[PDB]
Amino acid sequence: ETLAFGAALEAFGESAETRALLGRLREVHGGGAEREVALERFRVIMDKYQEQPHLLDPHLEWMMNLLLDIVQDQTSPASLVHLAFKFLYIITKVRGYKTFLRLFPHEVADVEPVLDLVTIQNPKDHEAWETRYMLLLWLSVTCLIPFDFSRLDRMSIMDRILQIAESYLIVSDKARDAAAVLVSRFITRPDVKQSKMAEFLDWSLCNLARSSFQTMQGVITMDGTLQALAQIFKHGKREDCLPYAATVLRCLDGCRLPESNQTLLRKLGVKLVQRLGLTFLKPVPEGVERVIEQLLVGLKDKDTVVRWSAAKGIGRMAGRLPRALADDVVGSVLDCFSFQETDKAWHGGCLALAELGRRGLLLPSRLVDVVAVILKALTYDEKRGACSVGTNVRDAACYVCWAFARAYEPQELKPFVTAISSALVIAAVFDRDINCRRAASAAFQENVGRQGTFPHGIDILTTADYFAVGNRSNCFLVISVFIAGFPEYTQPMIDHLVTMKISHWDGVIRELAARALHNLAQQAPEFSATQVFPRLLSMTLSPDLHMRHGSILACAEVAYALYKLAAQENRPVTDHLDEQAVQGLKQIHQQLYDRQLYRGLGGQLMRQAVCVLIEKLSLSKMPFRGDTVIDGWQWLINDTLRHLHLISSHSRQQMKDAAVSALAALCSEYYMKEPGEADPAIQEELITQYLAELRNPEEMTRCGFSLALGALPGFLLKGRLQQVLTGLRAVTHTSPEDVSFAESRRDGLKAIARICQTVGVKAGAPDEAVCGENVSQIYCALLGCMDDYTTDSRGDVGTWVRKAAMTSLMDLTLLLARSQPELIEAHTCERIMCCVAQQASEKIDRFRAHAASVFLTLLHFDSPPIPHVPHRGELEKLFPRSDVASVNWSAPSQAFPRITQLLGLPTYRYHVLLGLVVSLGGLTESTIRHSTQSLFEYMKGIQSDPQALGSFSGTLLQIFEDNLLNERVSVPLLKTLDHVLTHGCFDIFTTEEDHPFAVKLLALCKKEIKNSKDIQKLLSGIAVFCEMVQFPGDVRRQALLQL
Amino acid sequence: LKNQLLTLKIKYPHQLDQKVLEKQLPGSMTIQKVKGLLSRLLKVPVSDLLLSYESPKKPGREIELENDLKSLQFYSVENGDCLLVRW
Amino acid sequence: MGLLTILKKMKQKERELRLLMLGLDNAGKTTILKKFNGEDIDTISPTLGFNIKTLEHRGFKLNIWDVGGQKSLRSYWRNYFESTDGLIWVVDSADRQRMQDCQRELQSLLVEERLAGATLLIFANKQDLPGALSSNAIREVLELDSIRSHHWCIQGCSAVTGENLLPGIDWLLDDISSRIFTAD
Amino acid sequence: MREIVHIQAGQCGNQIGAKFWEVISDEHGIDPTGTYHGDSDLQLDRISVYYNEATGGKYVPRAILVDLEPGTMDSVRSGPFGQIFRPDNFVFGQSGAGNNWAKGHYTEGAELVDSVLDVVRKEAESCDCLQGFQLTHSLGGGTGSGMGTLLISKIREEYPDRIMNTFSVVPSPKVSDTVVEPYNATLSVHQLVENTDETYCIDNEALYDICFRTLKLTTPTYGDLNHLVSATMSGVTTCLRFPGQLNADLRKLAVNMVPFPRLHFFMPGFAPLTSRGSQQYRALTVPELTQQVFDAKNMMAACDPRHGRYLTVAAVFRGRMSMKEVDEQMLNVQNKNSSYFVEWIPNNVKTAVCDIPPRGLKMAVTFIGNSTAIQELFKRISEQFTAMFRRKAFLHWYTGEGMDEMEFTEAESNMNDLVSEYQQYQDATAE
Ligand SMILES: Nc1nc2c(ncn2[C@@H]2O[C@H](COP(=O)(O)OP(=O)(O)OP(=O)(O)O)[C@@H](O)[C@H]2O)c(=O)[nH]1
Ligand SMILES: [Mg+2]
Distance CA D316, CA D305 (A): 19
Distance CA A194, CA A200 (A): 11
Mark which residues 101-140 of A lie under 8 Å from D by CB.
126, 129, 133
How buried is A455 (Cβ within 10 angstroms: 0-12 exposed, 13-18 middle, 19+ buried)? exposed
Mark which residues 83-112 of C lie under 8 Å from A by CB.
none
Q: Are A855 and A837 in contact (CB under 8 A)?
A: yes
- Spell out which residues line ligand 1, taking CB within 6 angstroms: D 10-12, 15, 68, 96-99, 138, 140-144, 169, 171, 175-176, 204, 222, 225-226
User: Long-range CB contacts (< 8 A, 24+ apart) of D292-298?
Assistant: D292/D365, D293/D269, D293/D365, D293/D366, D293/D367, D294/D344, D294/D345, D294/D367, D295/D344, D296/B74, D296/D344, D297/B73, D297/B74, D297/D210, D297/D214, D298/D210, D298/D269, D298/D270, D298/D271, D298/D272, D298/D273, D298/D367
Kind of pairing between the strands at D169-170 and C19-23: unpaired
Q: Cβ separation of D400 and C2 shorter than 8 Å?
A: no
Tell me the β-bridge partners of D200.
D266
Look at phi and psi of residue A105 and say left if phi exceeds 0, alpha if psi is from -120 to 50, else beta.
beta
Mark which residues 385-424 of D lie under 8 Å from A by CB.
386, 399, 402-404, 416-417, 419-420, 423-424
Q: Are A172 and D83 in contact (CB under 8 A)?
A: yes
Contacts across the C-D interface (CB distance below 8 Å): 21
- For residue D160, how many C-alpha atoms fall within 13 Å in the half-sphere facing its CB? 5
Length of chain D: 431
The pick from D7, D8, D11, D170 for probing ligand 1's pocket by mutation, whose C-beta has the most ligand atoms within 8 angstroms, reads: D11
Indicate which residue of C12, C70, C100, C107 is catalytic. Answer: C70
Q: Cα D201 to chain center, whole Å?
A: 7
Which of the residues D208, D216, D295, D380 would you substitute to probe the B interface, choosing the one with the greatest number of B C-beta atoms within 10 Å?
A: D216
B-C interface (Cβ pairs under 8 Å ≥ 3)? no
Is the CB of B76 inside 8 Å of chain D's CB atoms?
A: yes
Distance CA B11, CA B22 (A): 9
Q: What is the dihedral of CA D236, D242, D243, D246, to 10 degrees?
A: 0
* Distance from the A219 Cα atom to the nearest Cα atom in chain C, whole angstroms: 23
Is the CB of C4 inside 8 Å of chain D's CB atoms?
A: yes
Q: Which residues of D touch C2 (CB under 8 A)?
A: 111-112, 115
Residue D332: name the closest of D321, D342, D323 by CA.
Answer: D342
Q: Cβ separation of D397 and C113 shorter than 8 Å?
A: yes
Q: Are A294 and A249 in contact (CB under 8 A)?
A: no
Distances (CA, A) of A325 to A314, A319, A641: 12, 10, 72
Q: Are A4 and C153 in contact (CB under 8 A)?
A: yes
Task: Determine the residue of chain D that is closest to B72 in CA distance.
Answer: D297
A-C interface (Cβ pairs under 8 Å ≥ 3)? yes
Exposure string over A336-349, b if 16+ CB within 10 A, otherwise e: bbeeeeebbbbbbb
Q: D-side interface with C, Cβ within 8 Å?
A: 93-94, 98, 108, 111-112, 115, 396-397, 400
Q: Are A185 and A111 in contact (CB under 8 A)?
A: no
Alpha helices (H) in D91-170, listed in sequence order: 101-102, 113-125, 148-158
Collect all residues with Cβ–Cβ distance below 8 Å to D83 and sequence separation of at least 6. Answer: A172, A173, A216, D32, D77
Exposure string over A787-796, b if 16+ CB within 10 A, otherwise e: ebebbeeebb
Residue D201: name the closest of D288, D264, D274 by CA.
Answer: D264
> Of D55, D118, D157, which is closest to A386 when you measure between CB atoms?
D157
All partners of chain C with 3 or more CB pairs under 8 angstroms: A, D
Q: Are A204 and A229 in contact (CB under 8 A)?
A: yes
Kindly report the protein residue whose alpha carbon is nearest to atom 20 of ligand 1. Answer: D10
CA–centroid distance, residue A55 to ligand 1 (Å)? 24
Residue A639: name the closest of A682, A674, A668, A596 by CA.
Answer: A596
Question: Has C70 been annotated as catalytic?
Answer: yes
Tell me the β-bridge partners of A249.
none
Collect all residues with Cβ–Cβ distance below 8 Å to B55 and sequence separation of at least 6. Answer: B78, B80, B81, D216
Name residue D98's amino acid. Answer: G
Q: Which residues of A touch C167 (CB under 8 A)?
A: 3
Kind of pairing between the strands at D198-200 and D265-271: parallel
Strands (E), B1-81: 5-11, 22-26, 50-54, 63-65
Distances (CA, A) of A540 to A370, A410, A614, C61: 37, 46, 15, 57
Q: Which residues of B touch D297 (CB under 8 A)?
A: 73-74
Name residue A547's amino acid. Answer: M
CA angle, corner A1016, sides to A1014 and A1018, nearest 5? 70
CA–centroid distance, residue D167 to ligand 1 (Å)? 13
Distance CA A132, CA A173 (A): 10
Other beta carbons within 10 Å of A353: 31
Q: Are A393 and A380 in contact (CB under 8 A)?
A: yes
Q: Are D198 and D237 in contact (CB under 8 A)?
A: no
- For residue A1032, how many C-alpha atoms fall within 13 Å in the half-sphere facing its CB? 4
CA–centroid distance, residue D141 to ligand 2 (Å)? 7
Q: Cβ separation of B74 and D296 shorter than 8 Å?
A: yes
Collect all residues with Cβ–Cβ distance below 8 Å to C27 and sequence separation of at least 6. Answer: C125, C126
Residue A105: name the closest of A133, A77, A139 by CA.
Answer: A139
Distance CA A497, CA A482 (A): 16
Ligand nearest to the CA of D203: 1
> Of A172, A466, A794, which is closest to D402 when you measure between CB atoms?
A466
* Distance from the B82 Cα atom to the nearest Cα atom in chain D, whole angstroms: 15
Q: Are C81 and A442 in contact (CB under 8 A)?
A: yes
Q: Cα C20 to chain center, whole Å?
A: 6
Kindly report the protein residue whose alpha carbon is nearest to atom 17 of ligand 1. Answer: D141
Mark which residues 250-309 of D lie under 8 Å from B by CB.
296-297, 304
Kindly report the protein residue whose alpha carbon is nearest to atom 10 of ligand 1. Answer: D140
Distance CA C3, CA A312 (A): 12
- For residue A985, how many C-alpha atoms fall within 13 Å in the half-sphere facing its CB? 23
Ligand nearest to the CA of D98: 1
Kindly report the protein residue whose alpha carbon is nearest to atom 27 of ligand 1. Answer: D171
Collect all residues with Cβ–Cβ distance below 8 Å to A635 and sequence separation of at least 6. Answer: none
CA–centroid distance, residue D138 to ligand 1 (Å)? 6
Q: Are B33 and B42 in contact (CB under 8 A)?
A: no
Q: Cβ separation of D396 and C2 shorter than 8 Å?
A: no
Tell me the β-bridge partners of A922.
none
Distance CA B53, CA A464 (A): 63
Q: Cβ separation of C49 and A57 shorter than 8 Å?
A: no
Distance CA A80, CA A299 (A): 50
CA angle, corner A640, sides to A636 and A643, nearest 5? 135
Ligand nearest to the CA of D137: 1
